[PDB]
C-alpha cells in the first residue's frame, strides 16, 4: 500500500485518479454531493503539508471508483490550486470529527 487509511489500501494511481476528478470540478467552479465536494480544506488539524495552500478536499473511495456524488466515506485526497498532492487523510482513527494522515 502506497497510502493506508485505516483498513483501506491505496496505490499512487488510485490517488492520482481521485485527485484528477476533484481538480476538474474545482476548476469548473462546480461541486457534487450533499457536502459539496470538492471544497476548501482549512487545515484546522495543522498537518505540515509540503505544498502550498489553498487546499481542497475530495473523497477517495475504498471501492476503487471515482467519487460520484453519494456517500463520501472516511477518506480524502487533499490537493492545491496547482493540482499538487498535499496528502491523503481520513476520519478513521481520529477523535471527534478530525482527520489523521494516512500512512
Ligand atoms: N476536520 C476538518 N474538516 C474540514 C476542514 N476544512 C473544512 N472541513 C469541513 O468542511 C466543511 C465545509 O468547508 P468550508 O469551511 O471550506 O466551507 C467544514 O465545515 P465548517 O465550516 O462548519 O467547519 C468542515 O466540516 C479542516 O481543516 N478540517
Author numbering: 2 to 104
What does the paper say about this structure?
Lenz et al. published the structure of ribonuclease T1 (RNAse T1) with the nucleotide guanosine-3′,5′-bisphosphate (pGp) bound. The structure was determined from an in­complete (90%) 3.2 Å resolution room-temperature data set collected on a four-circle diffractometer with a sealed-tube source. The same group later determined the structure of RNAse T1 with pGp bound at a much higher (1.8 Å) resolution. The pGp ligand-binding position differed from the previous low-resolution result, particularly in the positioning of the guanine ring. In addition, a phosphate anion was found to be bound in the catalytic site that had not been observed in the low-resolution structure. Accordingly, it was decided to re-solve RNAse T1–pGp. Positioning the pGp ligand with rhofit and subsequent refinement (with target LSSR) strengthened clear density for a separate tetrahedral anion in the catalytic site. Following Lenz et al. this was modelled as a phosphate. The pGp ligand conformation, its binding contacts and the positioning of the phosphate anion in the catalytic site are consistent with those described by Lenz et al. for the same complex solved at 1.8 Å resolution (see Supplementary Material1). It can be concluded that BUSTER ML refinement with target LSSR allows the most important features of the pGp T1 RNAse complex to be found from low-resolution data.
To provide easy-to-use automated NCS restraints, it was decided to adopt a different approach that uses interatomic distances rather than structural superposition, extending the ideas used in the SHELX program. The restraints encourage NCS-related chains to have similar local structure, but differences are allowed to occur at a fixed cost. The restraints can also be used for another commonly encountered case of molecular similarity, namely that to a separate already determined structure that remains fixed during the refinement of the structure being refined.
